Amino acid sequence: MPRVDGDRLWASLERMAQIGATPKGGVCRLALTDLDRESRDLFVQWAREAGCTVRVDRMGNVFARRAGRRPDAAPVMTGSHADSQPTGGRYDGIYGVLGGLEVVRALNDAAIETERPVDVVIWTNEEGSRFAPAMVSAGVFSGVYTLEYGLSRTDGAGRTIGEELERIGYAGAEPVGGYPVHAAYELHIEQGAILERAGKTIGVVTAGQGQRWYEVTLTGVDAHAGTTPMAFRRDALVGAARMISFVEVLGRRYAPDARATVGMIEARPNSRNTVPGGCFFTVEFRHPDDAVLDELDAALRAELARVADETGLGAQIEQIFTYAPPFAPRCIDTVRDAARSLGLSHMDIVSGAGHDACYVARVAPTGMIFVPCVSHNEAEAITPEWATAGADVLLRAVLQSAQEA
Amino acid sequence: MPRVDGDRLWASLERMAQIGATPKGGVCRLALTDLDRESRDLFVQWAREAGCTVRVDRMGNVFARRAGRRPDAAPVMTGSHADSQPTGGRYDGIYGVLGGLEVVRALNDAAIETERPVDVVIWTNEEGSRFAPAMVSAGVFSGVYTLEYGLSRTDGAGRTIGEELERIGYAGAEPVGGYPVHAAYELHIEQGAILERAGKTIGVVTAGQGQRWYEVTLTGVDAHAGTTPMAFRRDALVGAARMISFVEVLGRRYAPDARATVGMIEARPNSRNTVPGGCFFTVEFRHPDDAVLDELDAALRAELARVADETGLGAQIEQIFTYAPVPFAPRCIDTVRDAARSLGLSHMDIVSGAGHDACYVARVAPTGMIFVPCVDGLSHNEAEAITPEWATAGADVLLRAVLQSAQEA
Numbered sequence: 001m002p003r004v005d006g007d008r009l010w011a012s013l014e015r016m017a018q019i020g021a022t023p024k025g026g027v028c029r030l031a032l033t034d035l036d037r038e039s040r041d042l043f044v045q046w047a048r049e050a051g052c053t054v055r056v057d058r059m060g061n062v063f064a065r066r067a068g069r070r071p072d073a074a075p076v077m078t079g080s081h082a083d084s085q086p087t088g089g090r091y092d093g094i095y096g097v098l099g100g101l102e103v104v105r106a107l108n109d110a111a112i113e114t115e116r117p118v119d120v121v122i123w124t125n126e127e128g129s130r131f132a133p134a135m136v137s138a139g140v141f142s143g144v145y146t147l148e149y150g151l152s153r154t155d156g157a158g159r160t161i162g163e164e165l166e167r168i169g170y171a172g173a174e175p176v177g178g179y180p181v182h183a184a185y186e187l188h189i190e191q192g193a194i195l196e197r198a199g200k201t202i203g204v205v206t207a208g209q210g211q212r213w214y215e216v217t218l219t220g221v222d223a224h225a226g227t228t229p230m231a232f233r234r235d236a237l238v239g240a241a242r243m244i245s246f247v248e249v250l251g252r253r254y255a256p257d258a259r260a261t262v263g264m265i266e267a268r269p270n271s272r273n274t275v276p277g278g279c280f281f282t283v284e285f286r287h288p289d290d291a292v293l294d295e296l297d298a299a300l301r302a303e304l305a306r307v308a309d310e311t312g313l314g315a316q317i318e319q320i321f322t323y324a325p326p327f328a329p330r331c332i333d334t335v336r337d338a339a340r341s342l343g344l345s346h347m348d349i350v351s352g353a354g355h356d357a358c359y360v361a362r363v364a365p366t367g368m369i370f371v372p373c374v375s376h377n378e379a380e381a382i383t384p385e386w387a388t389a390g391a392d393v394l395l396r397a398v399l400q401s402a403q404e405a
Numbered sequence: 406m407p408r409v410d411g412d413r414l415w416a417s418l419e420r421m422a423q424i425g426a427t428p429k430g431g432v433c434r435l436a437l438t439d440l441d442r443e444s445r446d447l448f449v450q451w452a453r454e455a456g457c458t459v460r461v462d463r464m465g466n467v468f469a470r471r472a473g474r475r476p477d478a479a480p481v482m483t484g485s486h487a488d489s490q491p492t493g494g495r496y497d498g499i500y501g502v503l504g505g506l507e508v509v510r511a512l513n514d515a516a517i518e519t520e521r522p523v524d525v526v527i528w529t530n531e532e533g534s535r536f537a538p539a540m541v542s543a544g545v546f547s548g549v550y551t552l553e554y555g556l557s558r559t560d561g562a563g564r565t566i567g568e569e570l571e572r573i574g575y576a577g578a579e580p581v582g583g584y585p586v587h588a589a590y591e592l593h594i595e596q597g598a599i600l601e602r603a604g605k606t607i608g609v610v611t612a613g614q615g616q617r618w619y620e621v622t623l624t625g626v627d628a629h630a631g632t633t634p635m636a637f638r639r640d641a642l643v644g645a646a647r648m649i650s651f652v653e654v655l656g657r658r659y660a661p662d663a664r665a666t667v668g669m670i671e672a673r674p675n676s677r678n679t680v681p682g683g684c685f686f687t688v689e690f691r692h693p694d695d696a697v698l699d700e701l702d703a704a705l706r707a708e709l710a711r712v713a714d715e716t717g718l719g720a721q722i723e724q725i726f727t728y729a730p731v732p733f734a735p736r737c738i739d740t741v742r743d744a745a746r747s748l749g750l751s752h753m754d755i756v757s758g759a760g761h762d763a764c765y766v767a768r769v770a771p772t773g774m775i776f777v778p779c780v781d782g783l784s785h786n787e788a789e790a791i792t793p794e795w796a797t798a799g800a801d802v803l804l805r806a807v808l809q810s811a812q813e814a
């Protein structure tokens with residue numbers, strides 16, 4: 001099997017990172033800005049230079065197609081997003097886009113004919129910063145959202161995605177999704193420390209995380225600290241402290257894949273010489289298994305009831321967000337087998353963040369490939385070896401799928 | 406032994422409560438306002454009608470003196486403040502003042518002569534709302550503050566205490582403090598629910614609380630919750646939670662008199678989907694025993710170090726306020742307790758959880774305090790209330806205490 005040109009890949013990442021470069025060495029390329037256009041334009045140029053046919057759909061998704069023996073066969077698709085967070089890094093999303101480009105180049109150098117066409121994609125507005133929601137364009141593609149909804153999303157100035165697509169010249173003619181896709185692979189940095197600390201180069205992504213978000217309000221009695229003895233108190237902050245501790249306990253209880261976090265708290269009146277009579281805090285559970293999330297939910301509620309009973313606090317809880325994550329076994333195995341045949345260190349991993357691939361999974365057999373990083377930060381970084389390794393895994397996986405009858 | 410006239414005392418409280426009456430049934434009578442002046446003038450009028458000689462000092466403190474057999478003898482002093490919080494009750498401070506007036510009237514009715522003169526005092530600006538700080542005038546009296554400091558405290562209008570004293574006619578000529586006082590007693594509502602819930606009418610106040618205040622900053626690592634396994638986390642808020650729970654443990658460990666509280670917390674960045682990398686919170690200890698406060702300090706600092714170690718969090722702690730406990734005079738305390746006993750009144754020892762003028766006066770005179778309960782422990786609220794029975798009982802104890810000390814050679 002062929003090999004990617006690591007130096008060529010690295011050079012393209014270096015070149016692309018100039019567009020929207022921040023002084024801290026990060027990237028600010030918000031969706032459908034002029035800088036987004038400049039980045040898109042450069043990809044298009046490079047793709048066409050690689051002999052690809054580049055098309056654009058009505059959500060401005062860019063597809064660079066490399067020829068296959070069967071021009072009407074469902075393609076193998078790979079890619080990611082080019083747009084960033086306001087204080088994004090040089091590799092969030094774009095590494096997957098340029099990794100896909102290097103795959104095409106590598107197939108060209110090896111003079112390989114595939115049975116199926118290969119599409120390298122840029123998804124519009126993945127990060128969901130200028131327009132909400134995130135992953136909206138892959139969402140339209142995958143039937144999560146309608147085209148009407150996708151195009152009507154507005155920024156702070158009241159400009160819609162549809163209006164901006166026309167402004168920067170990416171109001172494409174192609175339908176958004178609706179055609180069969182044989183398989184899809186997204187190469188992405190981990191945006192975490194699991195691979196790096198485990199000393200593993202390749203993350204075989206098995207699933208996304210399910211999520212449960214809660215808001216909890218504890219009600220006690222505002223009291224002067226000096227004049228109120230401990231036995232008379234209804235301290236809502238102490239009640240919350242008990243819950244915060246128990247949330248951490250729950251996270252460790254369902255290790256390694258559970259995420260359990262209290263990230264926001266507000267005490268009232270929040271004055272140092274008064275017993276807090278109220279406290280609001282959030283809870284979020286993440287785990288790839290809905291059954292485990294149900295356990296976490298039941299434990300949280302049962303404990304909240306015990307705390308209220310013991311403390312005499314009033315308690316209210318409300319689940320405010322619920323999300324169920326599944327990648328295809330075939331793609332997962334293909335990714336693992338590719339890593340193995342390349343002699344690359346690897347491990348199964350769960351994605352702790354959303355990606356376009358999470359939605360593409362709904363319409364085509366989909367997998368993801370993670371590489372380590374030293375995210376959502378201007379200092380996030382990968383090594384040339386990591387960049388090459390992820391791209392070599394991508395090449396192998398895409399090639400295998402593309403030769404499938 | 407003489408007895409107070411409960412109906413008379415109650416009538417005086419109802420009448421005074423008219424001055425600055427609020428629709429919610431409270432009192433809004435800020436220090437050195439015209440309402441405060443009216444209240445002062447009425448007390449002065451009643452005191453003179455009861456045969457007292459009234460004097461005013463340079464901080465506007467009002468002293469009504471009931472003559473003693475030996476005019477040059479050190480006086481027994483009693484009283485409180487007449488001024489209120491913006492949403493004050495009908496009994497915060499003024500109960501002690503009118504209690505003192507009732508003591509004078511009761512001594513008159515019984516035709517009693519005392520060895521020592523008795524002073525009934527109104528302290529200027531106790532509540533410290535219009536001018537900061539609180540208890541500033543008893544403070545000057547007691548050496549806490551200079552006269553220059555006391556007179557120069559300004560309100561939001563740029564007007565000083567000195568200027569306002571002159572405006573309302575209470576820029577007195579007498580020196581502020583600096584003379585021998587035989588004993589001092591202040592009658593005051595508890596401003597807490599200890600007496601009410603224990604079913605005790607009289608609180609024998611043994612001390613005012615010492616205080617130690619702290620600021621604590623825990624430093625962790627900002628991290629996205631979904632992508633960060635528990636084992637990698639440096640959660641500053643969980644660290645704080647551990648400390649908050651421990652602070653409660655410390656308060657309950659030194660029951661019944663310890664107060665241990667985390668009243669303020671600030672997490673950062675305080676977003677629901679991220680592991681908090683920073684957390685600020687306050688700690689305050691209160692206790693009548695400085696040795697216990699020392700132990701609380703040591704325990705807090707020891708556990709903070711243990712938690713920082715075990716969690717991998719950076720920790721910072723600063724004691725930003727220190728206040729020594731104010732024990733009251735043993736003889737005054739015993740005098741109060743003995744009085745309650747002789748009157749067949751239910752009573753218990755209690756520690757004051759709030760500052761009073763008497764806390765400062767304790768520095769320059771043998772001082773004690775007498776508490777009565779208040780409904781629900783409510784105070785500095787317009788719905789603050791005592792019963793006639795409680796009002797009468799507090800005044801009866803004050804009468805006997807003042808009487809005993811004023812007859813001491």
Ligand SMILES: [Zn+2]
Nearest residue numbers: 081092093188
């Ligand atoms: Zn991304």
Ligand SMILES: [Zn+2]
Nearest residue numbers: 486497498593
């Ligand atoms: Zn008071």
